[PDB]
Amino acid sequence: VLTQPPSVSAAPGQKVTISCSGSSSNIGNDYVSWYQQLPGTAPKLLIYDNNKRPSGIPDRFSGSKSGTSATLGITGLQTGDEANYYCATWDRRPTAYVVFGGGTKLTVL
Amino acid sequence: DTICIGYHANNSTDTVDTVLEKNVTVTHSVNLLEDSHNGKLCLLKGIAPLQLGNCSVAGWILGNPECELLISKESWSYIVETPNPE
Amino acid sequence: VQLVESGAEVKKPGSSVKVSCKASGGPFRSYAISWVRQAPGQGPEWMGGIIPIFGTTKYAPKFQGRVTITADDFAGTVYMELSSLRSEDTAMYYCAKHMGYQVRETMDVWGKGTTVTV
Amino acid sequence: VQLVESGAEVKKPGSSVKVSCKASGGPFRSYAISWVRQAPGQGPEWMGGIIPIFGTTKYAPKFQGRVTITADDFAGTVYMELSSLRSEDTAMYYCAKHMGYQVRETMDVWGKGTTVTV
Amino acid sequence: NVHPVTIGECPKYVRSAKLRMVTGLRNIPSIAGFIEGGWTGMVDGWYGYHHQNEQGSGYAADQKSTQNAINGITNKVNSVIEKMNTQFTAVGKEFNKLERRMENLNKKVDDGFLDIWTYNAELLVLLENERTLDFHDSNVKNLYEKVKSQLKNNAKEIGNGCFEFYHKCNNECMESVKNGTYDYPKYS
Amino acid sequence: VDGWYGYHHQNEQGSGYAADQKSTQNAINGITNKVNSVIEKMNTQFTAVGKEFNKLERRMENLNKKVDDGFLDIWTYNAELLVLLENERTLDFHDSNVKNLYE
Ligand SMILES: *[C@@H]1O[C@H](CO)[C@@H](O)[C@H](O)[C@H]1NC(C)=O
Ligand SMILES: *[C@@H]1O[C@H](CO)[C@@H](O)[C@H](O)[C@H]1NC(C)=O
Ligand SMILES: *[C@@H]1O[C@H](CO)[C@@H](O)[C@H](O)[C@H]1NC(C)=O
């Protein structure tokens, strides 16, 4: 499984980094993707290929991965950037499957 | 120290036809023709048809004494007739 | 591309439920399709997916044995059947699409979702 | 592949006789066709053959000059004409097929045969 | 090919008994390359590699070319489906004894249209089946040439679709040759 | 003269022509299959004669003429297009066969 901090909070206009520490089987040998989920809506893809952004995603979202741990960074926080964030990867050893992270609540002040 | 280039194979037994060749086994294919039915008259989007039975169109529309049961039906999706009505 | 699920269902424990997802465009797709679920107050869980042309189906060890995924290509529909329902199966289900023909961790298009209550 | 000959003939010395062979399948063949004959109490004798597409015809030195082999492709028929009949021409005739487009010593399919009496 | 008379949303009626469209490759179950035959050990794609080095050997699939092949085949099948429209309600008529010419004309029209559509369907399927196989062969050849145009003199071509390296290279070299980014000067 | 593709050899004992029996056989097989398929896709015509109409039946006569003309146009187009399209593929096939033998 992928472990993330349960909750991180910061003031508007600041910079927030959300982590996630798996193992050598899930993150250490595969890519990581980052999804955002607003209340009442389906999850929305934010980052894929560990640094790439889909069309329509603002530049203030970024991602990286060092060794076993991946990080998602958000700058220029607004009131509308408060939602759930999930890290997902493609675990593959006994029987491969998609594994999502525990989730992290981003609260703004 | 060695590397080779190749393609896929399985144990499929489907065959296709070509202008230059016949009866060629392939790995994947699709069928574009349907040749099966259920053998019954069935509803058409929830509306039942009108069945005449012994009667023909003339007997149904004229009021043949043997076609009384058809009087009460006033809506249908299609009309079914018997090959040799009496 | 738009994915539309079926309606909501109310089932009894021990029964089975089948749901369908319809995708806009041509009947034949060049991308894989996966099923995800989420219980209230919890996170998403991946159930299984299906691959075009080849027709291979993959499932999760938690859901292996009870779930079955099929596809009908000339109508562009994907069906998922779940059996031996319990009280913990109450959740909202989504059908999601991948960019390629392989089942991976990146899904770019999701459906509205449908609720299954037991 | 089935080869069918024509009926039996009764001819007079000095006359000529034409026989036909019909082959089952598509009208156009990818194999050569040969004519063989056998007298009662004797062995087979090769007369001549014809080649597809190219249309080349080959004959035997004994029969060269008196025999003519032709083909009609859109009906799938092969004709053989023999002239200057004698008493020794009384024999049974077969049309045989080869595996390839060339006339060789190996024939794998034979016909029933037809008798020519003088 | 069930019945000419239909009511509702129905497929088009033809006189054919077989209409099958190929989407995959020729099935030739034959370690050597593509010149001998196909690999039953490669299951996740249509084209790929088999590598053998000091740390072991194994099969892998080229995810890049398979995607374009699938895109093209899916487009072709969708176009074929789209070019043919669905049949609507079409039932017969009735005539009395003094109306034989009209009946004969009706029958002639029906028979002619049926003949034309049967011919069209059969010809289309027959003609597309060959182009699909040519497409697959061209894809395999292009992959082989792309790999050959990356090793130059550092490898020997043994003529069966395989390359033997003059130098020794570990799994990283294999993963770089199957990547498109191979350092020729490094191993010169 | 005995084939479609072949070799010419020259060595100390002499020179001469020869034909490759192997590739010619596949070429002949393919061409024969193509011609047979073309023949089979077209069916034979059966009895078809005209009709007669009186002076107060001009619309039926015009409809009959329209049907006949339309079917004739469609079949002429089909035949000509089929022949034109197959003629190019045959020549490409022969060129590919020669190139494959050389390689
Ligand atoms: C053969 O095909 C069947 C499916 O029809 C299945 O047993 C398997 O995919 C294949 N098995 C072998 C041994 O090739
Ligand atoms: C129709 O005719 C048959 C005569 O065999 C009769 O038995 C039947 O009762 C009639 N009515 C229906 C509704 O079939
Ligand atoms: C393979 O290619 C990717 C991107 O093209 C690159 O990030 C990776 O380092 C390459 N691997 C090797 C072993 O060169």
CSV table of N, CA, C and O in Angstrom, one decimal, chain A residues 89-92 94-99, chain C residues 46 59-61:
chain,number,residue,atom,x,y,z
A,89,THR,N,-0.5,3.8,-8.1
A,89,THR,CA,0.5,3.1,-8.9
A,89,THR,C,0.1,1.7,-9.3
A,89,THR,O,-0.9,1.2,-8.9
A,90,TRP,N,1.0,1.1,-10.1
A,90,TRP,CA,0.7,-0.2,-10.7
A,90,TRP,C,1.5,-1.3,-10.0
A,90,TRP,O,2.7,-1.6,-10.4
A,91,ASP,N,1.1,-1.8,-8.9
A,91,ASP,CA,1.8,-2.8,-8.2
A,91,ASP,C,1.9,-4.1,-9.0
A,91,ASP,O,0.9,-4.5,-9.7
A,92,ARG,N,3.0,-4.8,-9.0
A,92,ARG,CA,3.2,-6.0,-9.8
A,92,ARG,C,4.3,-6.9,-9.2
A,92,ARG,O,5.5,-6.6,-9.3
A,94,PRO,N,3.1,-10.6,-7.1
A,94,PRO,CA,2.3,-11.9,-7.2
A,94,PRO,C,1.2,-11.9,-8.2
A,94,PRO,O,1.2,-12.8,-9.1
A,95,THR,N,0.3,-10.9,-8.1
A,95,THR,CA,-0.7,-10.6,-9.2
A,95,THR,C,-0.8,-9.1,-9.3
A,95,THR,O,-1.2,-8.5,-8.3
A,96,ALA,N,-0.5,-8.6,-10.4
A,96,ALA,CA,-0.4,-7.1,-10.5
A,96,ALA,C,-1.8,-6.5,-10.4
A,96,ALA,O,-2.8,-7.1,-10.9
A,97,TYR,N,-1.9,-5.3,-9.8
A,97,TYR,CA,-3.1,-4.6,-9.7
A,97,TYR,C,-2.8,-3.1,-9.4
A,97,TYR,O,-1.7,-2.8,-9.0
A,98,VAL,N,-3.8,-2.3,-9.6
A,98,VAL,CA,-3.7,-0.9,-9.3
A,98,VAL,C,-3.9,-0.7,-7.8
A,98,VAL,O,-4.9,-1.2,-7.2
A,99,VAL,N,-3.0,0.1,-7.2
A,99,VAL,CA,-3.2,0.4,-5.8
A,99,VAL,C,-3.2,1.9,-5.6
A,99,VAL,O,-2.4,2.7,-6.2
C,46,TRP,N,-9.8,-0.5,-6.7
C,46,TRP,CA,-9.8,-1.0,-8.1
C,46,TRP,C,-10.3,-2.4,-8.1
C,46,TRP,O,-9.8,-3.2,-7.3
C,59,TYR,N,-8.4,-9.0,-12.7
C,59,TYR,CA,-9.2,-8.7,-11.5
C,59,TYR,C,-8.2,-8.5,-10.3
C,59,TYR,O,-7.0,-8.7,-10.4
C,60,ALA,N,-8.8,-8.0,-9.2
C,60,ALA,CA,-8.0,-7.8,-8.0
C,60,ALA,C,-8.1,-9.0,-7.0
C,60,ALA,O,-9.2,-9.7,-7.0
C,61,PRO,N,-7.1,-9.3,-6.3
C,61,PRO,CA,-7.1,-10.5,-5.3
C,61,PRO,C,-8.3,-10.4,-4.3
C,61,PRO,O,-8.8,-11.4,-4.0
